[PDB]
Symmetry: D2
Subunit: 293 residues, 4 copies
C-alpha cells in the first residue's frame, strides 16, 4: 500500500506581496501551472521551496487551503508540517489532514543538536495526534542532520512512516535504503540527479524546478525506466543547464520570474530573501528562449 | 542608558507537559539569576531559553515575565531574531516597548542566505524598532560564519552596538577586539570564559551562569586583576560542571540543578526529552562536589 | 591504445617488515587480468598502499606489475607524491617501462593554492612527456576541484582525463558535458551503475580485484539499457563492498585473494592484519557470492 | 641529567635551491638565528613548517644533522620523525636519537582513514624501535585527524609518550588535557593564540613565526604568566599583525624573506610551493619597518 503516493511533485513556490503576505491569486496560478501545464502528479506543499520556514502558522494554513482548492481530486497532495514548534507541527498536521491531504511530511528537527530518539519521537508524536501517513523530509544540506540505515530501520518500523523525501547526495546510502526497504516510498529531492535517482529505483521525485521544467523531468523518469538511458541523460544535461543557471541567480526568486514570463502573478520572495536581481535578466531571457520555458 | 557590560544569564524556561510556559517557575529562574547568582543581567529568548521551539505569543509571554521578575538596575537584552522577519520586528517592537535595553538577533539560518540578505535583516529590524542591536553569532547552531570584513560592514551601523560571540576562534576574537575597540563583545562560551576575559571581552552570556554565576564572576574578576592562576583553577572547576551537564543534556540538566534549590523547573519543551534519571546519581555527586 | 575500460586498483602484498612480496604481487596482477578479466591495472594508487611506500618500493611495484601482464593490458602509473622530485623520478621511471599514462594525486596536507596544484601537474608533464590523468580522491586528500579548475587543467593537451572519486553526480555530469573528449574513469565501486549512466568511459576499483566480472556486467548492461539487471548486480556488489569496508578493505580484499591460493601477504603497518573475528562472516560472503 | 623540555621553540624553516635541494649553509644560519638572535630555547626540526612532508629521507637526515651541529649543547632539540611510512619514521627516529635529540615527535598518521588503535600502535611501534621519548604532533588543520580526550588518555598512559605539540584551535579540549595530565608536556602550536595558551597553562610553545618574532613571543609568555595580562595581550595584538600579514602572503616563503632581509641565505620554498610574490614586497617592507623585524 505504501506506493500510493508515487509520482512527480512540484515543490510548490509561493508568491508574496511587499509585506511578506501570501498572494492568494498567484498561488492558485502556481498550483494550477504545476498540474495543468507541467502535467505533474501532485503538489508538495509548505516545503523548503515554498519559503515555508519564513512563515507564521496562519500563513501556512492559508497556503494549504489555497493549494488544495486550486486542484482536482486526482491530484496527489503531501503536506509539509514539520517545525521546531511541535505544537505547531501537530496543529498544522491536523489542519492539513482535515482538509484531505494524502500524507504529511516533516523536516528532521534542526538548529538544536537533538538526539536521534528526540528526532524519532517528534515523528511519532505528530503521527499519534494526526493519525495520517508520514514522510520523512531529509535535507541534510539545510538541516545538518544525517539519517543512517540503522536509524531508517527504526523509523520505518512505524507502519505510518511510509517513506522518505530523500535529499542526501549519497547514491551508496540511497541504494542500501532502496534494498533494505523495498516496500517503502522513496521520492528523491535532487532535481539535478533525477536520472541517477531513477535508475536507483526511486518511486518518484519532489522538485522546485519541476514548476518550470516538469515535462523534461517526466521524460527523464520515463525514458530511464524504459532503459532509454542515453536519451534520458541528454535531457538531464539540458535540465542541469536550467538548474545550474537558476541556482547562480537565486533559485526561488528566479523560478518565480520564469513563471511571471508565463503571465503568472509571481509576486516577490519573502524577506530576508531579496527580489530577483535584474543584472541577471538577460541571461535568464536567453535560458527561457533556449529551453522554451 | 546602561552600559551593557557584565555577566548575563541566558534565561532558561520551565514548561509544562504541553509545552506551555510555567510562568511561576520562570519568575523563580529569573530571580535566582539576579538574587542568588548575582548576575548583572538577563539574556532573554536566546537559544538556551528554548526560544526557537516557541510560538510568537509564548515569546512575548517570556519577555513580559522576565521583565516583571527583575528590578530596574538589571540589564536586559531581548533576543528577537527569527526566520520570520515580521515576527522578529513584532517581537522587537514589543520588547522595546517593555523597556529592554537592547535587542539581539540570531543570524538567519536554514536557508543559504547571502551576506547582503543577512545584513539587511539586521538593518530592517533596527529601522522598524529604533533600538540598539547585538549580533547573536552561534556558528555551531546556525552554520553561519561572519568574517572580519562582514563585522566591519555591520558595525558601520550606528545601532549595531556589539556582538554575542559564541565562536571558538581566539584569533578571530582578537582581530575583532582590535578592529572594533568601541563595540560591545560579550562571549558566549562558558567553558572558555577565562580565555575570553584575557582577550578583552566586555562580559559574557551563558546558560551555566544560571547555576555557576559566583565562580563565573570570579573568573571574570580574577583574570582582569591578573590573578590568572586562580582564575584558571576556577575554570577547571567550572569546566568539570559544563562537561557533566553537556553529557547529560544541558538544558534539562541545568533546570534539574535549579529544581534542587526549590525552583519549580518544570520540563523541557518537546521535542527535547526530560532529564534521564539514569543520570540522577552522577548529578547528585556533581551538585555535592561543587556546592551547586 | 585507447584507455577506456575497467581497471583493478592493484593491491600489494607485504611481509611482516612492510617489504613488497614480489611473487604475491605478480599473482595479484595476473589474477586481475586472467581471472577478473579486467582491461588494465592502475598501479601505485591509494589502494596499493602507495602512500606508505618508499621510492624504491614504488619502483619495485611498477616493474613487477608491468612484467606480470602482457602487452595488450592497459597500464596507468600513479606517481603523484607530496615530493615533486620523487613524482618526476617516478613518472620518468614508469614512462621508461612503457606505462600508457601517468596519474597523480592532487597535492594534499599543505594548503597549496590552485595555481600551485596546477603547476605540479604541468611540471610533471613537462619532465615526463607522457599523458596525465588527474587523480581526484577528495575523501583521502581533503582537496576538491571545481568545474572551473578542471577546465584550466583540461586545457592542457597532455591532461587526458580524470580518475573521479568525488561522490557528486551533479559535478560529474557537468564535467562529462563540458569535456566530451576527455577520459573519465570513476573511482567509487559502490556507484558504478550511476557512474556508467552518467557516461564515464570506464572505472578504477580495488574491489574489482575480487569482483571484476560483476563490475563488467554492471558496466555493459547499463549501457545496453538493461538497467534493472545492472542495478541488481549493483545491490549484490554493494553487499560485498559494504562487508569488505566494515572489515578493513585492503587486508580483507587480500584475504579473499588468499582464498584462491594467492600469496596475499600482509598489509603495511600502521594498517593492521585481517582480524580473525571477521573470518566466519567473510567465509559466508565468499560462499554467498562465489568469491 | 636529561633536559627539562619546557620553553619556546622555533619551528625550523629550511632554505632550498632551485631544484628543491637543502641549502645547508642557509639552514645553519636559520638555526643560529633562532637561538642567538631570537633567543629561543630550542629547535623543533622537520615539522610541517620545515616543509618536511615534501622531503625524501636523505633530505630529512640532512636537516637533522645540520640543525644539531648549528647549536650549543644546552639548546633543546625535538626531532619530528613521523611519516606515512613507519619504516621511514623508525629510521629517522633512530637517526635523530643517535644524534642526541632530546625527544622525537610524530604526526598523527593521515591520508588513509586509520583506526585509532592503528594510530596508537604507530606511536608505540616508534617508541619500541627507538627507546626515546615521544611527543604527539597534533595538527588537525593539516592532517584532518582529531584526538579526543579519551584518545589522549590512552596515548598518555604510555610513560614514554611524554606530551603533545598541540597545534589545534580548541581551548575547551586544551583545558581538559591540561587538567587531566598535570604530568605531561604541553607545547602549543598556534602562534596567534599564544597568550590564551599561556594562561591555559601550557609548558611552552613551538612556532614558525618565532623565527622572526621570538622576542615578543617570550614577553607574551613571561608577562601573561606574571599576571601582566593587558601588556601581554597588547603584544599578542602586535604579533598577530605580523602573523595575519605573513599568512596572507604565503607563510613559509614570507618568513624566509624576512630572514633574507637580515643577511641570511634563506633560499626558496620547495615546489609545488611557489616563491615569495614580489607584489607583496612593499607591504612586507612596511611590516618589517613597523615592528623592526
Amino acid at each position: 500500500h505504501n506506493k500510493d503516493l508515487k509520482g512527480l511533485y512540484a515543490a510548490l513556490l509561493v508568491p508574496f506581496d511587499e509585506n511578506g503576505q501570501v498572494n492568494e491569486q498567484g498561488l492558485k496560478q502556481i498550483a494550477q501551472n504545476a498540474i495543468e501545464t507541467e502535467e505533474l502528479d501532485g503538489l508538495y506543499v509548505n516545503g523548503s521551496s515554498g519559503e515555508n520556514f519564513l512563515l507564521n502558522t496562519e500563513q501556512k494554513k492559508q497556503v494549504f487551503k489555497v493549494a488544495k482548492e486550486a486542484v482536482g481530486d486526482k491530484v496527489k497532495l503531501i503536506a509539509q508540517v514539520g517545525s521546531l514548534d511541535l505544537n505547531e507541527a501537530i496543529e498544522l498536521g491536523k489542519y492539513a489532514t482535515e482538509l484531505g491531504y494524502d500524507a504529511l511530511s516533516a523536516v528532521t528537527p534542526f538548529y538544536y543538536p537533538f538526539t536521534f530518539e528526540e528526532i524519532r519521537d517528534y515523528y511519532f508524536d505528530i503521527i499519534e495526534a494526526t493519525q495520517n501517513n508520514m514522510i520523512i523530509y531529509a535535507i541534510p544540506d539545510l538541516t545538518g542532520v544525517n539519517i543512517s540505515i540503522e536509524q531508517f530501520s527504526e523509523l520505518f518500523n512505524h507502519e505510518k512512516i511510509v517513506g522518505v523525501c530523500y535529499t542526501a547526495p549519497n547514491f551508496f546510502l540511497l541504494e542500501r535504503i532502496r534494498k533494505a526497504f523495498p516496500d517503502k516510498l522513496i521520492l528523491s529531492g535532487f532535481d539535478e540527479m533525477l536520472v541517477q535517482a531513477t535508475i536507483s529505483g526511486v518511486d518518484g521525485a519532489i522538485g522546485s524546478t519541476y514548476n518550470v521544467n516538469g515535462r523534461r523531468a517526466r521524460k527523464i523518469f520515463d525514458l530511464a525506466r524504459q532503459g532509454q538511458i542515453q536519451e534520458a541523460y541528454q535531457l538531464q544535461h539540458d535540465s542541469n543547464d536550467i538548474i545550474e543557471t537558476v541556482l547562480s541567480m537565486g533559485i526561488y526568486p528566479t523560478l518565480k520570474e520564469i513563471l511571471r514570463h508565463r503571465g503568472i502573478d509571481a509576486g516577490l520572495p519573502k524577506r530576508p530573501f531579496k527580489p530577483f536581481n535584474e543584472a541577471h535578466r538577460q541571461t535568464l531571457d536567453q535560458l527561457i528562449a533556449k529551453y522554451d520555458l
